[PDB]
Design a protein around this ligand. Structure first.
Ligand SMILES: Nc1nc2c(ncn2[C@@H]2O[C@H](COP(=O)(O)OP(=O)(O)O)[C@@H](O)[C@H]2O)c(=O)[nH]1
Length: 599
């Protein structure tokens, strides 16, 4: 019963304008043996058809439309609840081209393993061919992809997370390049066999071939493992492209800040997961005359324009956010984005009237059905109602403070790049780099307590190539650029704590005051202290008007203590040794310079 190429249903009616794509699909279909092949078009009628089928399969339940229109809740197999690092590989030809932040395997060996897994993996399933565009369609030469998947769940979320379907397919023309992205949940079915709501496999791989720009995923239907745009393309493959083609693919939010004189500024900020970020991208300023709009909260792609400035575009089309922690008081604009519906919730809790709830959200519901389908009772049940890593998947276009430039293929000019992590000591609230190479060093040595892990540019699990070569790439772009047009680089810390354990700086909206200092520095309208680590404002350099806070706590937040920084040195030094032979001299230079300035 193994079926050949042109007898698999849906293959005879396949679009044929792009022969490379069609040959690839046929080769894949021959291998995985699905019941049928469907090319998705991203239309609303298709979206509803797939959602209905998801409801019928039990994968989705339809949420009360009075509270979220066109919205769904999906509960995963508990063994498949997140992105898995140790199962993620960069399979460059040479191990050194993956380097010490990456998991490597010989690509010939990986292909032998995965090709074996893929054989007959789609039996009894529909194989979807999902064309998609990264970034606005308006671009002349955008980065395109096609995800083949046996997961309908994946198709629906890809429609939200990328520009999916007919348009992207047309953009590929007859011979356009695209990233081949292959995915299976690894759960073949016999004829007539009852599926489960969330199929998956104990055997999981998430593999990237940087040279050919390919992504092979198997065994997981969840998140970044399966939505191949989200990190696999946006960061892993894209960063390798950017390396070769002279640009930057980064783990950054893009923020639009507008001053009281009505001038707009655009900032990119690299914070690791949970150092957010989502909150900064959706800032509501607490000082009069300042407004903020968002272009994105996770990925930024940046290229130098004609005028020598650095321009950023958000390559994604949707938000894929962590639900718990999100609430109306901390992040009302995120909540309003969600409130407009068209959202897929994964692993949150269900209320009695078909709303959704997760830990930290308002309401105090008395009874819930939790993320595993069990009864949950307020102030009694000892387990979390929602999975701690549960998700919302929501269109970007519903964000009430979406910047009008959000879908512009030309991008936005970046004035400032920010780096930050969770540091309870040592790092001050905000610091400005001395120049580009010092900013690269700051990015390169970014620490976050999540005992301090180094997470360079928030890219630790996401680099598509050797971390040292990546630092060198950052260095090279600044050396060959007009220094006057380069974004200024800043180093922030929202999480410094006093001895009594409280946050020295209140943060959230109040971070607008830090952003105001940053803008003034770019305009040369503010001063600061020259310290061994960079330019750090004193309390009197910050607008603290109307902020109910002890000025002493602010001074403490801004302090540069040499003893603390001397303890930081060997930690940094050991990280630079870990970076290995490809550590750029330029980075080591900045280490020595900082050490010398410290005395
Ligand atoms: N103390 C403090 N915590 C914050 C601040 N901004 C975000 N956090 C908290 O850090 C967590 C993660 O924030 P989030 O923006 O969702 O992070 P992301 O994953 O980088 O997008 C949430 O629990 C926030 O309440 C801040 O400015 N100050």
């Amino acid at each position: 019963s193994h079926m050949t190429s042109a007898t698999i249903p849906g293959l005879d009616t396949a679009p044929t304008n792009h022969q490379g794509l069609l040959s690839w699909v046929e080769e894949v279909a021959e291998l995985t043996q699905p019941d049928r092949v469907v090319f998705t078009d991203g239309s609303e009628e298709e979206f509803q058809r797939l959602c209905d089928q998801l409801v019928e399969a039990g994968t989705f339940i339809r949420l009360n439309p009075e509270k979220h229109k066109n919205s769904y809740l999906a509960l995963s197999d508990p063994s498949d609840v997140a992105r898995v690092a140790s199962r993620t590989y960069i399979c460059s030809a040479k191990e050194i081209d993956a380097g010490p932040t990456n998991n490597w395997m010989d690509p010939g060996e990986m292909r032998s393993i995965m090709k074996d897994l893929y054989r007959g993996c789609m039996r009894g399933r529909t194989m979807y061919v999902v064309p998609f565009c990264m970034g606005p369609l308006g671009a002349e030469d955008p980065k395109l992809g096609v995800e083949i998947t046996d997961s309908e769940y994946v198709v629906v979320s890809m429609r939200t997370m990328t520009r999916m379907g007919k348009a992207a397919l047309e953009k590929m023309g007859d011979d356009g390049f695209f990233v081949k992205a292959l995915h299976s949940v690894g759960a073949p079915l016999e004829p007539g066999q009852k599926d489960v709501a969330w199929p998956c496999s104990e055997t999981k791989y998430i593999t990237h071939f940087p040279e050919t720009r390919e992504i092979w995923s198997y065994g997981s239907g969840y998140g970044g493992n399966a939505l191949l745009g989200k990190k696999c393309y946006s960061l892993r493959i894209a960063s390798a492209m950017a390396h070769d083609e002279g640009w930057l693919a980064e783990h950054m939010l893009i923020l639009k800040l507008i001053s009281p004189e009505n001038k707009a500024y655009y900032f990119a900020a690299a914070f690791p997961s949970a150092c957010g970020k989502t909150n900064l991208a959706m800032l509501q300023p607490t000082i009069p005359g300042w407004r903020a709009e968002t272009l994105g909260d996770d990925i930024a792609w940046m290229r130098f324009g004609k005028d020598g400035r650095l321009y950023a575009v958000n390559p994604e089309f949707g938000f894929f956010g962590v639900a718990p922690g999100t609430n109306w008081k901390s992040n009302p604009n995120a909540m309003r984005t969600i409130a407009a519906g068209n959202t897929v919730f994964t692993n949150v809790a269900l209320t009695d009237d078909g709303d959704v709830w997760w830990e930290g959200l308002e309401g105090d519901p008395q009874h819930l059905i939790d993320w595993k389908g069990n009864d949950w009772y307020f102030r009694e049940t000892e387990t979390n109602a929602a999975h701690p890593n549960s998700r919302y998947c929501t269109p970007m276009s519903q964000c009430p403070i979406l910047a009008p430039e959000w879908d512009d293929p030309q991008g936005v000019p970046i004035s400032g790049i920010l780096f930050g992590g969770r540091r309870k000591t040592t790092v001050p609230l905000v610091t400005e780099a001395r120049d580009w190479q010092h900013g690269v060093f700051i990015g390169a040595t970014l620490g976050s307590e999540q005992n301090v892990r180094r997470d360079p540019m928030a890219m630790l699990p996401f680099l598509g190539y050797n971390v040292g070569d990546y630092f060198q790439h950052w260095i090279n772009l600044g050396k060959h650029a007009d220094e006057s047009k380069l974004p200024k680089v800043f180093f922030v810390n929202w999480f410094r704590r006093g001895d009594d354990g409280r946050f020295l700086w209140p943060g959230f909206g109040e971070n607008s005051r830090v952003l105001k200092w940053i803008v003034d520095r770019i305009e040369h309208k503010a001063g600061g202290a020259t310290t061994p680590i960079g330019t750090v404002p004193a309390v009197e350099d910050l607008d603290l008007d109307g902020l109910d806070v002890d000025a002493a706590d602010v001074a403490a937040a801004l302090a540069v203590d040499a003893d603390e920084w001397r303890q930081e040195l060997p930690l940094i030094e050991e990280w630079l040794q870990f970076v290995g032979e490809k550590l750029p001299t330029g980075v080591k230079d900045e280490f020595d310079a900082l050490k010398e300035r410290l005395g």
